[PDB]
Write a protein that binds this ligand. Structure first.
Ligand SMILES: CN(C(=O)[C@H]1CC1(C)C)c1cccnc1
Length: 171
């Protein structure tokens, strides 16, 4: 059975207990912490591409009101985010299983942009998700996995200084 684990869940959970925030910029900002995934149970010899996307966890706009995040009352449907291809893709199962798959080069933006960067809506909550796509073979297959521990709200600047302090402490 294909197994997907989050690396450094210890640390993600500290961020999650505070409500995590990720900066978005017009040019695109890399994530901290970085999503790193442990994968076992692939065919060492089969070909796979890793995809990362961000699910809108709810349909609301969030605001930091008197030291607390609180959702708006006017939900709107959220169009799905674009997919980021891990730059090691396509690659053999052995490649993906020899070390945690690290999405260190994805950039989060608030503006529709050339290529690479993934556009999110500021003040929406997101749940990172990967797709593992078996390619080249006769039988295409997709395995998907969400990471609730890695949920964050997209922000143009940090609101909760406890997040700011954790970000620096651990970078
Ligand atoms: C890098 N790459 C893939 O891994 C393809 C299997 C996909 C569809 C996810 C690719 C290459 C050119 C154009 N699109 C996607």
């Amino acid at each position: 059975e294909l197994r997907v684990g989050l690396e450094e869940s210890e640390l993600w959970l500290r961020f999650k207990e505070l409500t995590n925030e990720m900066i978005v910029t017009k040019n695109g900002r890399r994530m901290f912490p970085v999503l790193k995934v442990n994968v076992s149970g692939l065919d060492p010899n089969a070909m796979y591409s890793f995809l990362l996307d961000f699910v809108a966890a709810d349909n609301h706009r969030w605001k930091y009101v008197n030291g607390e995040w609180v959702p708006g009352g006017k939900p709107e449907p959220q169009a799905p985010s674009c997919v980021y291809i891990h730059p090691d893709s396509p690659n053999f199962g052995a490649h993906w299983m020899k070390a945690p798959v690290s999405f260190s080069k994805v950039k989060l933006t608030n503006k529709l942009n050339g290529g690479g960067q993934i556009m999110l809506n500021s003040l929406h909550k997101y749940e990172p998700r990967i797709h593992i796509v078996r390619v080249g073979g006769p039988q295409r297959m997709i395995t998907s996995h969400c990471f609730p521990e890695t949920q964050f709200i997209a922000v143009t600047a940090y609101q909760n200084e406890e997040i700011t302090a954790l970000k620096i402490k651990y970078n």
